From Swiss-Prot, chain A:
Major capsid protein that self-associates to form hexamers, building most of the capsid in association with pentons made of the capsid vertex protein and one dodecamer of the portal protein. The major capsid protein self-associates to form 160 hexamers, building most of the T=13 laevo capsid. Folding of major capsid protein requires the assistance of two chaperones, the host chaperone groL acting with the phage encoded gp23-specific chaperone, gp31. The capsid also contains two nonessential outer capsid proteins, Hoc and Soc, which decorate the capsid surface. Belongs to the Tevenvirinae major capsid protein family. Homohexamer. Interacts with the portal protein. Interacts with the capsid vertex protein that forms pentamers. Interacts with hoc; one hoc molecule associates with each capsid hexamer. Interacts with soc; this interaction reinforces the capsid structure. A total of 960 subunits of the major capsid protein forms the 160 hexamers. This is Major capsid protein. A proteolytic cleavage by the prohead core protein protease gives rise to the mature major capsid protein during virus maturation.
Curated annotation (Swiss-Prot), chain B:
Capsid decoration protein that binds as a monomer at the center of each major capsid protein hexamer once maturation and expension of the capsid has occured. It only has a marginal effect on head stability. Dispensable for the head morphogenesis and phage infection. It comes from the Viruses. The chain holds residues 302 to 326 of 376 of the full protein. Monomer. Interacts with the major capsid protein; one hoc molecule associates with each hexamer facet. This is Highly immunogenic outer capsid protein. Belongs to the Tevenvirinae Hoc family. It is found in: Virion. It comes from Enterobacteria phage T4 (Bacteriophage T4).
């Protein structure tokens, strides 16, 4: 839904797809691109739940 | 010449094409 990254797989965040991790490389780049995902939904709950 | 910014994921594909016996990269 609203939290897709348009080139994503819609429901899986996998560190091997460069679009999900935003082109990140090695670890400190890649893992931190999860911490952006886990925000992006925690924000989106605030829309639906109100 | 020109300049196209490509990440290493294209170069991961390209170094996987030519090292597995493919034809273009």
């Amino acid at each position: 839904g609203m939290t897709l990254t348009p080139g994503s797989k819609a429901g899986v965040f996998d560190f091997q797809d460069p679009i999900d991790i935003r082109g990140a490389r090695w670890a400190g780049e890649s893992f931190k691109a999860l911490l952006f995902q886990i925000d992006k939904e925690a924000v989106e709950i605030a829309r639906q739940t109100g | 010449s020109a300049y196209i910014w490509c990440g290493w994921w294209v170069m991961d594909e390209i170094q996987k094409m030519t090292e597995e016996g493919k034809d273009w990269k």
